[PDB]
Amino acid sequence: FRTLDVDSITEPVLTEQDIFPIRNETAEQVQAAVSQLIPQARSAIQTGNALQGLKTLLSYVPYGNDVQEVRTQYLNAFVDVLSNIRAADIPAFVKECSTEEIDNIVNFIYRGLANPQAYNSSVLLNWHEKVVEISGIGCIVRVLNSRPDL
Amino acid sequence: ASFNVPIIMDNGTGYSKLGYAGNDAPSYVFPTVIATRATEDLDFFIGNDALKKASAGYSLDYPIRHGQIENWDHMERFWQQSLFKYLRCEPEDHYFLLTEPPLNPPENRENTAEIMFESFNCAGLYIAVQAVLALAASWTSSKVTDRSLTGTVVDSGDGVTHIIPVAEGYVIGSSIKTMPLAGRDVTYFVQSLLRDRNEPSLKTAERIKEECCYVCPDIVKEFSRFDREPDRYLKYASSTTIDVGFERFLAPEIFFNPEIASFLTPLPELVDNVVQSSPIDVRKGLYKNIVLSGGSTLFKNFGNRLQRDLKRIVDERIHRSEMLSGAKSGGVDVNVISHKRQRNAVWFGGSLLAQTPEFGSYCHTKADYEEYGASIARRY
Amino acid sequence: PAWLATC
Amino acid sequence: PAWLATC
Amino acid sequence: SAPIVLDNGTGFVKVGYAKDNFPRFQFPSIVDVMVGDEAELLQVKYPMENGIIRDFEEMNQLWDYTFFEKLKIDPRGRKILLTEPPMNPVANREKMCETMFERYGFGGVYVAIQAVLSLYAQGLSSGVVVDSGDGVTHIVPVYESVVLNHLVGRLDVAGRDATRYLISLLLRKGYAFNRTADFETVREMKEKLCYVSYDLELDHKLSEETTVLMRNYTLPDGRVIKVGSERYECPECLFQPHLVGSEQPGLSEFIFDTIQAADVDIRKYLYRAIVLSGGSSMYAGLPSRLEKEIKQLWFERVLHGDPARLPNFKVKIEDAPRRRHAVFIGGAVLADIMAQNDHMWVSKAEWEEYGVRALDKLGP
Amino acid sequence: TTALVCDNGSGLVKAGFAGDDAPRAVFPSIVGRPRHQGVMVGMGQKDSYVGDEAQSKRGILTLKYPIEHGIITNWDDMEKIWHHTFYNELRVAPEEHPTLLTEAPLNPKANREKMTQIMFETFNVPAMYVAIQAVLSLYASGRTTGIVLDSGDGVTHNVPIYEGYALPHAIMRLDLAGRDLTDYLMKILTERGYSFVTTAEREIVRDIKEKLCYVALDFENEMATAASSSSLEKSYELPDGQVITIGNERFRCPETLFQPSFIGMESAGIHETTYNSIMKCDIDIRKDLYANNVMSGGTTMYPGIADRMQKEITALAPSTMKIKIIAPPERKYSVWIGGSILASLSTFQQMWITKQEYDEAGPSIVHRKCF
Amino acid sequence: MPAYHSSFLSLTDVPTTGNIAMLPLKTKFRGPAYPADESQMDIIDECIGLFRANCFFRNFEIKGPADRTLIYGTLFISECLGRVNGLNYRDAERQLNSLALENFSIPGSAGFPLNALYAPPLSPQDAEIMRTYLTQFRQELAYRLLSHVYATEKDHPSKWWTCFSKRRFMNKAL
Numbered sequence A: 001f002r003t004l005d006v007d008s009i010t011e012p013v014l015t016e017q018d019i020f021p022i023r024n025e026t027a028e029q030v031q032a033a034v035s036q037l038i039p040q041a042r043s044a045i046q047t048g049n050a051l052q053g054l055k056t057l058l059s060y061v062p063y064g065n066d067v068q069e070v071r072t073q074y075l076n077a078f079v080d081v082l083s084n085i086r087a088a089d090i091p092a093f094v095k096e097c098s099t100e101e102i103d104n105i106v107n108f109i110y111r112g113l114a115n116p117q118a119y120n121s122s123v124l125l126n127w128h129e130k131v132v133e134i135s136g137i138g139c140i141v142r143v144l145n146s147r148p149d150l
Numbered sequence B: 001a002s003f004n005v006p007i008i009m010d011n012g013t014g015y016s017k018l019g020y021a022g023n024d025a026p027s028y029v030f031p032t033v034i035a036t037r038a039t040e041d042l043d044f045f046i047g048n049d050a051l052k053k054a055s056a057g058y059s060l061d062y063p064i065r066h067g068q069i070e071n072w073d074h075m076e077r078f079w080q081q082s083l084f085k086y087l088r089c090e091p092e093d094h095y096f097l098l099t100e101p102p103l104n105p106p107e108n109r110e111n112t113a114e115i116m117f118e119s120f121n122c123a124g125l126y127i128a129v130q131a132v133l134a135l136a137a138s139w140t141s142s143k144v145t146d147r148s149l150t151g152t153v154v155d156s157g158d159g160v161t162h163i164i165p166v167a168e169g170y171v172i173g174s175s176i177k178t179m180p181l182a183g184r185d186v187t188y189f190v191q192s193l194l195r196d197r198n199e200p201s202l203k204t205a206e207r208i209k210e211e212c213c214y215v216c217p218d219i220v221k222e223f224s225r226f227d228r229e230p231d232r233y234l235k236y237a238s239s240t241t242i243d244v245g246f247e248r249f250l251a252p253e254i255f256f257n258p259e260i261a262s263f264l265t266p267l268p269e270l271v272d273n274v275v276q277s278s279p280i281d282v283r284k285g286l287y288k289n290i291v292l293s294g295g296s297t298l299f300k301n302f303g304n305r306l307q308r309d310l311k312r313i314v315d316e317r318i319h320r321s322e323m324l325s326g327a328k329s330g331g332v333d334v335n336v337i338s339h340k341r342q343r344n345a346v347w348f349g350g351s352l353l354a355q356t357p358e359f360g361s362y363c364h365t366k367a368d369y370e371e372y373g374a375s376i377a378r379r380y
Numbered sequence C, D: 001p002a003w004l005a006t007c
Numbered sequence E: 001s002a003p004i005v006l007d008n009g010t011g012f013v014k015v016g017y018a019k020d021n022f023p024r025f026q027f028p029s030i031v032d033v034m035v036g037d038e039a040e041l042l043q044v045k046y047p048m049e050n051g052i053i054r055d056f057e058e059m060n061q062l063w064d065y066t067f068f069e070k071l072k073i074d075p076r077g078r079k080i081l082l083t084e085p086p087m088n089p090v091a092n093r094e095k096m097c098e099t100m101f102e103r104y105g106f107g108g109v110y111v112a113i114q115a116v117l118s119l120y121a122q123g124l125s126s127g128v129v130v131d132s133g134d135g136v137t138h139i140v141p142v143y144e145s146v147v148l149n150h151l152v153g154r155l156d157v158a159g160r161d162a163t164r165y166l167i168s169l170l171l172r173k174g175y176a177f178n179r180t181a182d183f184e185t186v187r188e189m190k191e192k193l194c195y196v197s198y199d200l201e202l203d204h205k206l207s208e209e210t211t212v213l214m215r216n217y218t219l220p221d222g223r224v225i226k227v228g229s230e231r232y233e234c235p236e237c238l239f240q241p242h243l244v245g246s247e248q249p250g251l252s253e254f255i256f257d258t259i260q261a262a263d264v265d266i267r268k269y270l271y272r273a274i275v276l277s278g279g280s281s282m283y284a285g286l287p288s289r290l291e292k293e294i295k296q297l298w299f300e301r302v303l304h305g306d307p308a309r310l311p312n313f314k315v316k317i318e319d320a321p322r323r324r325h326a327v328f329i330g331g332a333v334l335a336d337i338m339a340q341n342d343h344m345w346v347s348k349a350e351w352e353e354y355g356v357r358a359l360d361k362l363g364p
Numbered sequence F: 001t002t003a004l005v006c007d008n009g010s011g012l013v014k015a016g017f018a019g020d021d022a023p024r025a026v027f028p029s030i031v032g033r034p035r036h037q038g039v040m041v042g043m044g045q046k047d048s049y050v051g052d053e054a055q056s057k058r059g060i061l062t063l064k065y066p067i068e069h070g071i072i073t074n075w076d077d078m079e080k081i082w083h084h085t086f087y088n089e090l091r092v093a094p095e096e097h098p099t100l101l102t103e104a105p106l107n108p109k110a111n112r113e114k115m116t117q118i119m120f121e122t123f124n125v126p127a128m129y130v131a132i133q134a135v136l137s138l139y140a141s142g143r144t145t146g147i148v149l150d151s152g153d154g155v156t157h158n159v160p161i162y163e164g165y166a167l168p169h170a171i172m173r174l175d176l177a178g179r180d181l182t183d184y185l186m187k188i189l190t191e192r193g194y195s196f197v198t199t200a201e202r203e204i205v206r207d208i209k210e211k212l213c214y215v216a217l218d219f220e221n222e223m224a225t226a227a228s229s230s231s232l233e234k235s236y237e238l239p240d241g242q243v244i245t246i247g248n249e250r251f252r253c254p255e256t257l258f259q260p261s262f263i264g265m266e267s268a269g270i271h272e273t274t275y276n277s278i279m280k281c282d283i284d285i286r287k288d289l290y291a292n293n294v295m296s297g298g299t300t301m302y303p304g305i306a307d308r309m310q311k312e313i314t315a316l317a318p319s320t321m322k323i324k325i326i327a328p329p330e331r332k333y334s335v336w337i338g339g340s341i342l343a344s345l346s347t348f349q350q351m352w353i354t355k356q357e358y359d360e361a362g363p364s365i366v367h368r369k370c371f
Numbered sequence G: 001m002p003a004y005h006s007s008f009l010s011l012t013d014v015p016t017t018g019n020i021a022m023l024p025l026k027t028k029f030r031g032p033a034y035p036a037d038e039s040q041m042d043i044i045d046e047c048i049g050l051f052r053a054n055c056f057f058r059n060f061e062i063k064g065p066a067d068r069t070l071i072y073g074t075l076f077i078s079e080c081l082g083r084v085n086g087l088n089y090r091d092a093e094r095q096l097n098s099l100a101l102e103n104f105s106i107p108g109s110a111g112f113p114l115n116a117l118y119a120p121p122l123s124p125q126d127a128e129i130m131r132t133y134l135t136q137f138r139q140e141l142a143y144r145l146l147s148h149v150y151a152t153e154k155d156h157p158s159k160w161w162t163c164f165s166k167r168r169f170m171n172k173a174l
Ligand SMILES: Nc1ncnc2c1ncn2[C@@H]1O[C@H](COP(=O)(O)OP(=O)(O)OP(=O)(O)O)[C@@H](O)[C@H]1O
Pocket: B011, B012, B013, B014, B015, B016, B067, B156, B157, B158, B159, B160, B183, B184, B206, B209, B210, B213, B294, B295, B296, B297, B298, B299, B300, B343
């Protein structure tokens, strides 16, 4: 006998789970809505009212099929508009928020924490702790159970 | 750096023996014992020093027992002491030839390799077994090339004994056969025997053993020299004299007469089963070159007794087969030899081997462990 | 062992 | 066996 | 008035009647006389270390105990069939039939082969059967209710050998069971904590990197021991005879060569039907591991690296919870089937004339 | 510039120069690899073994025959054996000497061309020719017609020839040889009680076969005598010293050759296939073929094989047709003698296929310049 | 092994009695031992040596009544050597006679293992000869032990004969 890692038979199942609405060809394969909404958040930061900019930016969310430049720019603008916020009003913002929004927020917070040299991660840890103390472990267990790519 | 002389070390349950190569006799032999208790508590000793100690409050303990390491901390302390006090050598500019039992596990092997390569910053290291070296120490010249390799070695360590049917420098991993006797058990038995009749503990026991313990082709047909001539009742003194009685006449028979102490099978039957389990085309040679080793094996008439027993057993078996068939076969020839080597054949063979230049290549390099890690050596 | 030869 | 098919 | 069943095994012995799904009695053949379930201390014999018999007198004592203590019948004429390895020397079965026809009548026995017995038990007519006992294992093919008798394979490594290797490993670790006793305890711990490695490299890396896989097992005396890589290693010593000291290809390669030695038109029907028998085959992860090994061996020997058509192999191994008594069930079924006609058997008569030669009526 | 030859049979390689009456290298064709890892330093411990060394230290080395049934299986082992033969036994460089080869009929053209390619690209031989292992036996016998039956350790074939003109449509081949006989012998010995499963034990069984194994005319009568009396029980000693006794198996073994139904094969025996082959030819040459049929190669040195074959072919053929077997004592080296004679001949020189022809035309040339 | 053979499982005569043997010996006292003249193979010295050797043995399997006789002889020799420690020639002979005439009847009664210490006796229809042979064997063993250990140097038991009593045959002291 020998060892060859026979795997062609009984193929696994990867795409079956994690249903993909990626079949849009808009803002994920062409990067149009992202480029339309990012300048809005930038202007919101410039004027000062960054909460509305964050809310508008959180409306649409990309997916992690194959592209990473667009999602990295999204995460960069995210970290920027987050650092542009003060140390207050975060409780009110999270209380006047939905569940999927908080899940996406925590997912992006973690994706940002995955690269500390390029960001701060302190305000990120603070936001995560506040979200946990407000909502609870539900958001963490939901994001941990989300798609493996985002 | 493969140019200087390599150091040969051999740890053991009874005696650790270390020295250099290219020598006719070993060096730094001593019973492998350690003794210890702003604040350091580092004052310790080993060997004859530790033995003479314990009078001022120094504890004592045996690092290795039953043929297997038990305390790597004390083992490293012992190695450091023996390497930086007894031998004023440098572990970097010299290669090391270590010996381990055939049953040593890979965990202990790699632990030793790491603690030697890292802590002592060694350069060349080679771990081997005692069987092949003890066998190589059998022949005298080692250059005529008429020597033999197929042999059946039996090493009786002071804590445990075992048997290996080596064939052409190829050790066997299945026919190996161990036994927990032929060690300090004989000393404990002789002590329990002495403590029963004559209260005057173990030092004198081992002394009288090494002095007078011998074997006899029989015991019950024997005992007659004792019943007849009281001269056998020697008088040994340390501090007064003691009556030997029959310890010198009974102790070594524990091998040919097992199940006398804390069951087992006699040595002739064991070696016969070993040779039978081994392939068939090597038994004619295995029965031929049966070399011995270990101090506990260098008895007076050990070789003759074992040879007679194995010869009669094999002859009975072959005669059964013959009378069943009806032809006449050629009686296999069994032989035994021990030429001033069964005492410390391991170190002699190790040095004779290290004398070759291939030793420097067969060793392990520091860079190897640095890049691959502690997973270099796995098993023989 | 019990084959009158090998094993 | 060593005929790439039968035997 | 129905016949009896007795598949005298290496270390175990199971007995019942001509028709009984589960065996009525089963006890170790370990050995006044203590033969029987009294083992729960006198001498220990273990006569049938392999398919061969050494202490025929102790075997007679064991059979007497089984027929008089576990069973309450001492007849002369009541047919009773038997079992034995495929190529067991004729002397063994000769002595067996001689003692069972002299000390008792038992007119008609018709000893048979555990392979075809288990095949009957499963209710099949084609496929290959791999019996893995305690002292020996064998492999037998069959096609359309026909035996080949020339591709049968024997292999003298199983059970006892794996137990001895586990003992040697525990000795390497430090724990020693040199006593004649504790052999049953080691057997129990083996059958309790053992499993084949679907990926040997993966299991080795796991054992070397993780603390899991290390279990603590108690002993009857009271002390406790620790078990590690040996758990997943002993099925490897079963799979790799060279590790134990024997020169053989193994099990998967053995059956592969045995099948390839057959005719192509049969090969398929053998890869679709593969049965097992014997407690040694109950090692966890053995069937799927064997299937993967067969697939890899085919991929290597035949296709040489062409996975385009590998899925079109259609291998279907078979396993059940009753492989422990498949031979017994088959013997019972065959006895119930042949209890009508006495010609196929070997009556107590026609024995003194050419009794030994009568035994040649079964295997040409 | 004297030529040489090397018959690489499945049993043992017979290599020797030309113009000689007997070969020099008669060495077994086996490759042994150490079962264990080995730890000795400076005393052999080689990673492989070949030749008599394996047969000597066989109790440890796992053995492998590179070629089986005449087809090669391990080209690395084959070229290793060739190197050992050319550089150790013969002690000669083939760069200044041709090399005559041998092969069985109905063999893979791929195998033949690979042999030629490796011999030309590895040893730099100037020329390299192949031929059958039967026309050489015919030449050694010194005849020019007749049928020839070879029973090498790997294969067993028969070929007719008349005045030098072969008859491919009459050639016959079978995979029965000494290895299947040794396997059946091991099986029947296990039936007796003696077990032999390893490779060294296989070699011991082959030695037993070479030593004491015969044939008889009335197989049933011999079986009856062996089952009734014990006049056939013969003893043999082993290296261990425990003697053993063997009965009817010594003559029951070749019954496989005479009755392949024992091992499982469905083909007929040597007598039936020889009769069929002879019948495939024309009667005017059958008349002579029946009168001179030669045996060659191993597996036919058994005593009494001539009488059995004679009786069988006579019962299968008409009575008025005389029959005479030719089984000299110098058969194990008949192919080598024929190769040496052919290499020493004059005209055969022009048939030598050199290096430039292969380099410019490729291996496919071997299928045209040769048989 | 250390447990030598009894050297009595022969068929020279029929001195078997149920589970014991009354073959010839050197028992100067009375009993069931039939007369004899062979003064070469004395079973007394044979049993004495067997006991002195097995004093250190640690395993002994059943081997028939011929072996049970030797086992009983060794047990009696050990008991005598243990009970005659602090005595002299006179006291040694006194203790030997007491043990001989003591309450030691045919074996089987309470005082030994259930069935391994001795096989079933055959006193019914043979109790007379059984007791005679038992008494003769006990007296012979006691006399041999006294002559061996308690040598002519009275008031000084043999050093080795007494040191070899710290062990119990088959480890069945109680
Ligand atoms: N001439 C002799 N005859 C019999 N026994 C002896 C003799 N000389 C020494 N011995 C015994 O050998 C023992 C010493 O053995 P030694 O220390 O050489 O073994 P070892 O090589 O240390 O074994 P290991 O390496 O396994 O510890 C002593 O206890 C002593 O009883």
